[PDB]
Amino acid sequence: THRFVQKVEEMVQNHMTYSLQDVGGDANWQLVVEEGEMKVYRREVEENGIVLDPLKATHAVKGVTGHEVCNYFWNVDVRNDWETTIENFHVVETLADNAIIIYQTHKRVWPASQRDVLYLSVIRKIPALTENDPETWIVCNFSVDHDSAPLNNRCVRAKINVAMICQTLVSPPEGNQEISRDNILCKITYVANVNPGGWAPASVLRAVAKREYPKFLKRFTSYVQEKTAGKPILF
């Protein structure tokens, strides 16, 4: 129990309600990148030079579970093993054993000023209510205010709302035998809503995002495969 419990609930529920809705039929969402089971879509949104482009990606990763995926996405001790867009980060506050507040600076992209971000990062399990309701593991990373990290004059403060949402499919093997990682697949939906917090050139933001989101999703998912391949399956 902590002062951000209701905000956590709010963000989790929003993501379970809206982030899992199909965008495939919406004229405003475009398939920007596809590779293997990975599809990255974007809706181009610019409001008075504030480029908000909502981003949504789906992926299907063999040999890993949603619990595993969300653990490696959330766990700060393995962050630098896969993250490539950050200059530095540190934990500002531990709120609960599944919830922390992180301050991070991003690598500068010319010609825009450097961005920093201040966000609550929470990992949650959403129980299946019925058999056939998928169990869902989710990590929500969303900007919050914290007195220890006011606006500074060195960076533009971005605001983020990101979720990594995972459901795991197990194909029953032949009879009474072990479920191997060949029999498991993690369905991922990744969404990112980023307000750069200030003016940025749209064409540059868009080129970066189109390169960087796909790069992250391949690298991060391959990483989870690599770290887990030897291990017993954590469902």
Ligand SMILES: CCCCCCCCCCCCC/C=C/[C@@H](O)[C@H](CO)NC(=O)CCCCCCCCCCCCCCCCC
């Ligand atoms: C050299 C390239 C540097 C690009 C950095 C641009 C600055 C972006 C500012 C906010 C980004 C927020 C992304 C979310 C981070 C955390 O939830 C999480 C844990 O670290 N990681 C990811 O979701 C992993 C996401 C990895 C992919 C992120 C790239 C995003 C590129 C487009 C965003 C640009 C918006 C801000 C304006 C930057 C000025 C050009």
